[PDB]
Each structure stands twice: as structure tokens, then as C-alpha cells.
Symmetry: C3
Subunit: 86 residues, 3 copies
């Protein structure tokens, strides 16, 4: 048959001009960043995510997330605390 | 919304100008949105099946994993005709 | 299939300053790259991958890949090919 198929939602990783690494985390519905040096994982203040699939970071440090399960793209303008929906 | 009509987005990339590129997996297409734009453009890729990853180089060429077709395609800036890698 | 070959359900793509294209060849548990105007794909020396997904590359040529679904991020250091878990 193959009556049931499903796709695995993608996992994203991105690295900014300074080597800081940004990762989607499906199980905790969050996006985290890891500055190399400090042994600290920062949870970024995105909200209400459902299975973030992709992350990118522009020159200005702005972070963008494909929020797969909510059919949208969210961003966090660098040192803004409020998420915009694109 | 400002991106409009997305279904199950798989991937996002951002170019040096802050233009945002998105794989719209559920609709088999790739869309883009300039930094702080109202309007979105659909890129002229063709015959995609569940596009997934997207990247953009410093020349503005857009690369996409055509996950359902096991291939990678690319589109030069302002081109209408993709190349398969 | 022109120059990439034998891909199965690929996920992430990334491109470096040299225009080298990196593809997470998800279905084959490997990461492949294609140098500008080369006709030969290179399988990077990651080991122990399983359903990898996202891929990024920094200016230094370090490659990061999401791996074992949600479990981890693997970093391949340029030159040494030392693999570390982020
Ligand atoms: Co989807």
C-alpha cells in the first residue's frame, strides 16, 4: 500500500558574522543561540512556535524563523524583544 | 499577512540586502520579501516537489533543495530559467 | 543528475563565498558539496550522522549540520576535519 506517508519537518541551523550558532529545537518549540566562548545556551524570545523548521540571521543580527506548524514566518529584529510575523 | 498564502514553510534565507527567501513547501514554490516590504514575489522555479532548503549567495543567486525530486536547483538574479545542479 | 548525484530526500543547502554549494543529503546520512563550476561532488568527512537536516557554513569554512533529528548539531572544523558536537 504505503497508505500512510509523512514528512519529517526540517531542522535549521545558522551562524552569524561573529560565529554565534542559531538552532531550531522542535521538542521544546524554541530557537536557541550559542556564542562560542561562553558555555551558555540562550533561548531566543520567539513565542507560540510549532515545530520551527528553518532559521536565518542577517547582517544586523536579525533572526528569522519558519514556524512550520503555524504556517508563518517570524522575526526578531536585532535587540527588539517583540516578535514580528512577516 | 505580508507573506501571504504560505503552507508549511520549510526553509528561510536572507541576502545582504535583508530580502527574505522562503520555501513554501505545501504550495511547491519559493517566495521572497524585501526588508520591510508589503509585497511578496514568487520566484520562477518550475516543477518543484516539496522544496525544502533555500540559500542565497552574494550575487543574489537562489539555491533550493527540491526535496521531492532529489535535486538542487538554482536561479540567477533576474533569471527566468532555473539550472539543475 | 547533472553534477550532484545519488541524492535522496535532501534537506538543507548552504553556499560559501567561493560559491561552493553544500547539501544535506538527508536520506543518505551525509553532507555533499559542489565547488563552483566543478563537476565532482565531495562527501564531507562527517561521521555517525543520522537523518541530518540543516546545514550552514561560516567564512572560515566550518560546516555545521543538524543531526539525529533534534539531538544535536555537529561542527566540522575547516582543515583539521575535527568533528565536535556543539
Ligand atoms: Co510542510
Amino acid at each position: 500500500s504505503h497508505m500512510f506517508t509523512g514528512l519529517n519537518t526540517p531542522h535549521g541551523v545558522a551562524v552569524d558574522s561573529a560565529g554565534t550558532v542559531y538552532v531550531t529545537d522542535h521538542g521544546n518549540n524554541r530557537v536557541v543561540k550559542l556564542a562560542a566562548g561562553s558555555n551558555t545556551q540562550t533561548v531566543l524570545p520567539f513565542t507560540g512556535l510549532n515545530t520551527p523548521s528553518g532559521v536565518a540571521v542577517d547582517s544586523a543580527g536579525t533572526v528569522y524563523v519558519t514556524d512550520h506548524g503555524n504556517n508563518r514566518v517570524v522575526k526578531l529584529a536585532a535587540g527588539s524583544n517583540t516578535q514580528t510575523v512577516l
